[PDB]
Amino acid sequence: GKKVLIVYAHQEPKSFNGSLKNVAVDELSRQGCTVTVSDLYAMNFEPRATDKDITGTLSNPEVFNYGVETHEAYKQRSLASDITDEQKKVREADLVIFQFPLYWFSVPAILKGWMDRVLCQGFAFDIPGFYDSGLLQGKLALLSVTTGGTAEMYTKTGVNGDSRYFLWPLQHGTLHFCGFKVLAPQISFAPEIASEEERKGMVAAWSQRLQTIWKEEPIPCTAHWHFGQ
Amino acid sequence: GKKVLIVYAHQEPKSFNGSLKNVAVDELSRQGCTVTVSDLYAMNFEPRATDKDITGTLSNPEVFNYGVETHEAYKQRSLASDITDEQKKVREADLVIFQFPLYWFSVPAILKGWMDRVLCQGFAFDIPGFYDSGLLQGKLALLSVTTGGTAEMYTKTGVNGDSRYFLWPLQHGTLHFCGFKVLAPQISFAPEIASEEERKGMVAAWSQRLQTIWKEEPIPCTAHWHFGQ
Ligand SMILES: Cc1cc2nc3c(=O)[nH]c(=O)nc-3n(C[C@H](O)[C@H](O)[C@H](O)COP(=O)(O)OP(=O)(O)OC[C@H]3O[C@@H](n4cnc5c(N)ncnc54)[C@H](O)[C@@H]3O)c2cc1C
Ligand SMILES: Cc1cc2nc3c(=O)[nH]c(=O)nc-3n(C[C@H](O)[C@H](O)[C@H](O)COP(=O)(O)OP(=O)(O)OC[C@H]3O[C@@H](n4cnc5c(N)ncnc54)[C@H](O)[C@@H]3O)c2cc1C
Ligand SMILES: COc1ccc2c(c1)C(=O)C(c1ccc(N)cc1)=[N+]2[O-]
Ligand SMILES: COc1ccc2c(c1)C(=O)C(c1ccc(N)cc1)=[N+]2[O-]
Ligand SMILES: [Zn+2]
Ligand SMILES: [Zn+2]
């Protein structure tokens, strides 16, 4: 069997992102996978990294260091329950799909907060214990992104540069760092500009890709893959 | 005269980031600049992009589109006061310094939320009306970042790649997109590993640089600057 967590970041159920998340649930459910969705806006997910994330006696209450305190809280089981609830979903998953609209060449802040707070030291990585030695080794991750900009804008000679350039902090700096193997991104370009048929086509391309997702190999998550030369 | 806004994202006043923000206030105040600080954690700044960002009635209450709603709310003066308070600070500033610890090769979510919610359509850019036609042309921006990783890790052949690789979404996709001219980043590597004297040196280098900040030329914010030789 296979277990999938979809971390979804869109405010509107009727959105293009909503449709891509729903087709993923529908297709992976049809295959017999175990599927969980973390709908961050509906959960009112807390994005801020604060001292409210630790319940116990702080390691250094005089000078608050978020990374030190969360690492110690993870080991002591004194983290806030909203974080540990997400960590259980990630621990059980074989594949984590992130479904989101691109905001400033990155994830919306609510989803950035999920990465900041859930992927803590001791859970997702250790120093040492990162990149190929990351604690989430054996798991797959996939970014399914939608954009305002067209595919042409997202080219080497386009005004936004190649789309792989903006993937570096997410695929490499975050997911590969935690040990994930990264599947090729799904980028659904400019659905707002797209015709009704073109939008339908992008939703079906995603559903069709998911039919054979378990046969895919991960990308080589390197600087050469992202930037060339 | 010169006006500066510092957007600061650290939970702890006694932190290394706190010291870099304080020396920036001290030095720019000494020069006679007008200085404002947005201390996002102390403000409990809201990072989530939600329908609470629009006061009164929505353009389309049946299907919520954040970008459409905020663009229309900006034009109709119906944005939440926390957003318009930041927009006034940015509008008045000649230079915007962002002071933050690197979180997942990017800004902490609270600061990502400031970028998502404050730099709205009609205020910072329009569609079309971006990059050289962005609405913050004439302003300068500067990223002052601290890291966990050493300078050696942030090299082309280092495990994290060149530090310029992670700057692309922030400097190009966000700041340049809105029309800012981007000053060279200030990167304070691994202060937690550094000695007491080493950290004092990093703080002093930032204060010293600020003495001549108004004489600096911006970087060429291009793909070649970020990814080339
Ligand atoms: C703060 C902010 C920052 C941004 N920064 C960037 C950036 O850096 N770069 C960039 O390129 N873009 C950026 N954008 C734009 C953003 O990425 C796009 O608006 C977003 O990706 C569009 O996806 P969506 O789901 O919201 O589209 P929607 O507006 O929800 O979808 C478009 C259309 O598809 C229709 N649709 C829904 N479901 C289906 C279906 N099943 N079949 C057919 N049609 C369907 C909808 O009804 C609608 O008409 C930014 C936006 C914001 C708000
Ligand atoms: C969610 C998360 C994600 C992260 N992702 C990344 C990543 O992608 N890449 C990466 O490289 N790092 C990453 N980090 C690490 C993070 O960037 C560093 O921990 C941070 O930059 C350290 O800066 P600081 O201000 O918090 O240091 P502090 O711990 O506050 O500073 C270290 C010391 O400086 C002392 N000090 C304060 N002021 C002075 C002064 N004036 N003179 C001398 N000493 C002084 C303090 O007392 C303290 O002992 C991440 C951390 C977290 C929590
Ligand atoms: C905040 O940054 C952004 C917001 C919305 C955006 C973008 C950046 C785009 O680049 C884009 C966009 C939409 C249509 C065409 N023709 C081009 C770009 N939208 O919507
Ligand atoms: C979330 O990603 C991160 C968090 C903290 C980090 C890093 C990444 C490092 O790479 C690092 C780090 C710590 C000690 C030595 N010797 C090197 C790097 N810290 O602290
Ligand atoms: Zn990688
Ligand atoms: Zn640029």
Numbering used by the authors:
A (entry chain B), B (entry chain A): 2 to 230
Give verbatim lines from the article.
Based on our previous studies, which demonstrated that hQR2 could reduce a large variety of quinone or pseudo-quinone compounds, we hypothesized that hQR2 could play a key role in the bioreduction of these indolone derivatives, because they were pseudo-quinone compounds. In this case, the indolone derivatives would act as substrates, not inhibitors, of hQR2. In the present work, we demonstrated that the anti-malarial activity of indolone derivatives is linked to their ability to serve as hQR2 substrates knowing that QR1 is not expressed in the RBC.
Indolone-N-oxides (INODs) have antiplasmodial properties that target the asexual blood stage of Plasmodium falciparum (P. falciparum), with IC50 values (drug concentration required for 50% parasite growth inhibition in vitro = IC50) in the 1 to 100 nanomolar range. To confirm this interaction, we co-crystallized hQR2 with the chosen substrates, and subsequently determined the corresponding crystal structure. In this case, compounds 8′ and 10 were selected as representatives of the INOD and IND series, respectively, due to their high solubility in DMSO (solvent used to dissolve the compounds). Crystals of hQR2 in complex with flavin adenine dinucleotide (QR2-FAD) and bound to compound 8′ or to compound 10 adopted the orthorhombic lattice conformation (space group: P212121), with two molecules of hQR2-FAD and either compound 8′ or compound 10 per asymmetric unit. The ligands (compounds 8′ and 10) both occupied the same region of the protein; both were located above the FAD and interacted with the isoalloxazine ring through π–π stacking. The ligand residues could only be partially modeled in the electron density maps; in particular, no electron density was defined for the terminal anisolic ring, likely due to its flexibility and exposure to the solvent. Compounds 8′ and 10 did not establish direct interactions with the protein residues, but interacted with water molecules present in the vicinity of the binding site. The structural data clearly showed that these compounds lingered in the catalytic site of the hQR2 protein, comparable to previously obtained data on co-crystallized substrates and inhibitors of hQR2. The water solubility of these compounds varied strongly from one molecule to another, ranging from 10 µg/mL (0.33 µM) for compound 1 to 1–3 mg/mL for compounds 8′, 10, and 12 (3 to 10 µM).
